[PDB]
Design a protein around this ligand. Structure first.
Ligand SMILES: [Zn+2]
Ligand SMILES: [Zn+2]
Ligand SMILES: [Zn+2]
Lengths: 90, 90
């Protein structure tokens, strides 16, 4: 899945737009978040994204998971959200 | 759905056991969270729960959404996670 990295300052609506575009084009995307606020921003973005892909006959499902990631040569534990799209009607 | 309301002070590991128990028995559960910390605890709880049901060749899928909830005499926008059991895949 291509990866969208989210931070404490990321804006849910702009991230939601990106998620929506990746789901519409590739059918899946992953969001990586580290820290409380970033996780909150990511979840909000995913909920908003559902509203953008619905008119395109799509909804999404998410699977959260803990993952160890490298950042600034440091190893950090983060939360990753694997997101998949599927048609609402076929 | 049965509902679990997570607090900023909830222990992810305990909530995860509640989630796993419900998914195994009913195959679905809803988790509600109001503030950023509670949202973080919920996401961590859902991620740990995946490990609790994986043995049984079962995984889960989540769909987050905004929802208006009543807390005493106040209406509050919260986040809810609809969680459904999904028998595992390869
Ligand atoms: Zn550092
Ligand atoms: Zn109040
Ligand atoms: Zn009202």
């Amino acid at each position: 899945m291509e990866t969208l990295r989210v931070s404490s300052k990321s804006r849910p609506n702009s991230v939601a737009g990106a998620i929506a575009a990746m789901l519409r084009t590739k059918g899946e995307v992953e969001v990586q978040a580290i820290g409380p606020q970033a996780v909150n921003q990511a979840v909000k973005a995913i909920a908003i994204a559902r509203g953008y892909i619905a008119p395109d006959n799509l909804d999404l499902v998410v699977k959260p998971a803990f993952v160890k990631l490298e950042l600034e040569n440091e190893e950090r534990t983060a939360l990753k959200f694997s997101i998949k799209a599927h048609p609402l009607e076929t």
